[PDB]
Amino acid sequence: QTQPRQNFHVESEAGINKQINMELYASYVYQSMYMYFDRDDVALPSFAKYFKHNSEEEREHAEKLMKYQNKRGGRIVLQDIQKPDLDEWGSPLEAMQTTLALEKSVNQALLDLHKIADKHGDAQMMDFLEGEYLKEQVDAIEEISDHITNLKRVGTGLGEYMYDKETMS
Amino acid sequence: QTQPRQNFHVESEAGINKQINMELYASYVYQSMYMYFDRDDVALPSFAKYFKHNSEEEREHAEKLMKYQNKRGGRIVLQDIQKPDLDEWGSPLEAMQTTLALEKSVNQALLDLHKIADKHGDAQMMDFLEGEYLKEQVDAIEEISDHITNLKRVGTGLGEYMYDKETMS
Amino acid sequence: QTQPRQNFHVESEAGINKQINMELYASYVYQSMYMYFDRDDVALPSFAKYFKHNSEEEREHAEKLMKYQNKRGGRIVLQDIQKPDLDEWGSPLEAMQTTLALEKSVNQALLDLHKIADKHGDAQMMDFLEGEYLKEQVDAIEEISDHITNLKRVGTGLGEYMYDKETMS
Amino acid sequence: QTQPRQNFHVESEAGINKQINMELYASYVYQSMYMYFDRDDVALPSFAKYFKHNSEEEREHAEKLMKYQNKRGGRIVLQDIQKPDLDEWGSPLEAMQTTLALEKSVNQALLDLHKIADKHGDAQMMDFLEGEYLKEQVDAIEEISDHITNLKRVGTGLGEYMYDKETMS
Ligand SMILES: [Fe+2]
Ligand SMILES: [Fe+2]
Ligand SMILES: [Fe+2]
Ligand SMILES: [Fe+2]
Ligand SMILES: [Fe+2]
Ligand SMILES: [Fe+2]
Ligand SMILES: [Fe+2]
Ligand SMILES: [Fe+2]
Ligand SMILES: [Fe+2]
Ligand SMILES: [Fe+3]
Ligand SMILES: [Fe+3]
Ligand SMILES: [Fe+3]
Ligand SMILES: [Fe+3]
Ligand code: NA
Ligand code: NA
Ligand code: NA
Ligand code: NA
Ligand code: NA
Ligand code: NA
Ligand code: NA
């Protein structure tokens, strides 16, 4: 076995590799939304900045899981990062609704990964996932839900522009 | 020949004199737009200051070409600065669409001037035009495109006022 | 046509999209090398940090090309980011030799993209590529060449450790 | 019952007393390694300081568990602190390999103590152990694994001396 390995099951190791790829995938989706709102015919620069920041956060989530894999004596196995499902993301409201679905799918994957750790008595991995991932996902999901509600309230046109200026900046 | 002159074709010299006049013309157009948005019956003061600043930048572009003409040993020959095509420029959206057309025509003139330098092997003039003019024009055309998109999004009335207050200020 | 588009050929637009993917691919390679030297059984933390930094730099190279695509009126089309060719990278010397080959392939691809711009008279794109990409590539290639020479000089064992402590950070 | 006692099983109380002694034992092992590397015929002062620091940390781990025992209404019952298995600890590599085994034994004991808390539904004790002990043990085991790898890489003689100077201090 690797030097650090203790109470670390191969199924947990494999599950961490799967979650690493999912975090990178999310980072790529947000990078695409970033550059979509940077288009001259969309031109909402604080939305663009918001997705730039979320793309960087997802990349950090991936690297923290990579570091954790190494810390436990697992071996990182990278997979292709699949391109996002769309090249264009619609209105600010539609992009936020897409983001809510993405963050809920990531959250479900983390909960499933936590279940693997629980199944194998990996108390430290469960605590790592809870404090470093599950808590952040609950915060992120509520924040996106707030965005969607406000975007529905302000409507299209001037409301989108003001939301870019007031909340997203 | 003038003391500095080296690898500097009379056709490039003549082309710089033509471009100097075009920069001064663009400066005059923006000065007219500045004072149009300064009218009591238009009264959008940040739009006014935006065109004031662009008028000053265009004058700086013309003076930098005048200095370059002297530096290469060319001789500056000034022409009349033609008045702008209109006395009044319509809505903020229409004024910005007019500005996009102006900046694209200046850009095409600069590209044509670059072709003259290339035809005569004027490597230094090509680099001067690329770094000091071509790059700036691409940035300017994108920025104006962003303005047009945002002005379409916010609409007339309150939207034009808020655009003045948020983006243009 | 998109609002900004001027003197911008579809072949150049397509080549930029291809180069974006290659920059992202190189970022992924360096991220893998980062986490490889982070392994408990490799444990060279300044090599790790070097590849972390180079991964971040490649991601910025990609995003600068994405921003340039938008500025010229092109449309970003993302593709899958392929996983690196290896899961582990051997010695510090072998990883640096792999890095040299990677940077030379990126450089040849950028030179080929420059040839597309030249073919279509895209003066501004050539200057953008020269100043923002070609210059950095010859600096990076020389720097990696220096690393390879020093790694050959110091040998394996204590030499790799000291190079980590003294040159890499 | 003692005033604070709530949801605190006698088996968990006894397990904490056992772990207190194990932390004290680890502290004593590190204090011995500290003074071994302080010997005139070993004379690696940064290794010495490293084990001095680790001896203090283990003593703090013990005192934090004693404090927790009191907080829950348990009663501390101290046992003899057994002397370390050796009087001399060999090479830096051998000492680090011994410490990896020690930290893995401590980690297994903590995981077994966590199982006792789980068996009796002691949610607060499980969280205390996870956040204050299990996380630290995973970090410590990885750090020692790094040391072992580097010590194998640099070899004996000058490599040991340089490791003392560069990494340990
Ligand atoms: Fe994430
Ligand atoms: Fe739990
Ligand atoms: Fe917990
Ligand atoms: Fe100009
Ligand atoms: Fe690059
Ligand atoms: Fe040429
Ligand atoms: Fe050139
Ligand atoms: Fe150039
Ligand atoms: Fe301890
Ligand atoms: Fe405001
Ligand atoms: Fe305001
Ligand atoms: Fe040093
Ligand atoms: Fe030193
Ligand atoms: Na923009
Ligand atoms: Na694939
Ligand atoms: Na006024
Ligand atoms: Na005249
Ligand atoms: Na490490
Ligand atoms: Na001494
Ligand atoms: Na005894």
Author numbering:
A (entry chain G), B (entry chain R), C (entry chain H), D (entry chain B): 3 to 171
Could you give the paper's own sentences about this structure?
Ferritin represents a ubiquitous class of nanocage-like proteins that are primarily involved in maintaining iron homeostasis. Accordingly, ferritin plays a central role in taking up iron (as Fe2+) and storing it in a stable and unreactive form (as Fe3+-oxide/hydroxide). The crystal structure revealed that TgFer presented a typically 4–3–2 symmetry in a cage-like, spherical shell composed of 24 identical subunits, featuring highly conserved organization in both the ferroxidase center and the 3-fold channel. Each of TgFer subunits is characterized by a four-α-helix bundle containing two antiparallel helix pairs (A, B and C, D) and a fifth short E-helix that forms an angle of approx. 60° with respect to the four-helical bundle.
The Fe-binding position in the ferroxidase site of TgFer + Fe is consistent with that of TgFer. In the crystal structures of TgFer and TgFer + Fe, only site A of the ferroxidase center was occupied by Fe-1, but no clear electron density indicative of a metal ligand was visible around site B, similar to the structural features of Marsupenaeus japonicus ferritin (MjFer). In the TgFer + Fe structure, three Fe2+ ions form into a metal wire in the 3-fold channel. The Fe-2 and Fe-3 ions (intermetallic distance Fe-2–Fe-3 of 6.10 ± 0.09 Å) with occupancies of 60 and 70% respectively are each coordinated by three water molecules. The Fe-4 ion (80% occupancy) is coordinated by the three OEs of Glu132 residues (distance of 2.75 ± 0.24 Å) from all of the 3-fold symmetry subunits and three water molecules (Fe-4–Wat1 3.12 ± 0.14 Å, Fe-4–Wat2 3.07 ± 0.08 Å, and Fe-4–Wat3 3.17 ± 0.09 Å distances), while the averaged Fe-3–Fe-4 distance is 4.30 ± 0.10 Å. In addition, the 4-fold pores of the TgFer cage are defined by the 4 E helices from symmetry-related subunits, forming a four-helix bundle to which four Fe2+ ions (90% occupancy) are bound between the negative potential pore layer formed by Glu168 residues. Four iron ions ligand environment inside the 4-fold channel is completed by the eight OEs of Glu132 residues at distances of 3.10 ± 0.13 and 3.15 ± 0.11 Å and a water molecule with the Fe–Wat distance of 3.97 ± 0.18 Å. Although four iron-binding sites are coordinated by four Glu168 residues in the TgFer + Fe structure, similar to that previously reported His173 residue for RcMf, the E168A mutant has little effect on the oxidation rates compared with TgFer. Similarly, significant differences in the iron contents were observed between TgFer + Fe and TgFer + CuFe proteins, which were measured at 2,637 ± 2.46 and 240 ± 0.97 atoms per cage, respectively.
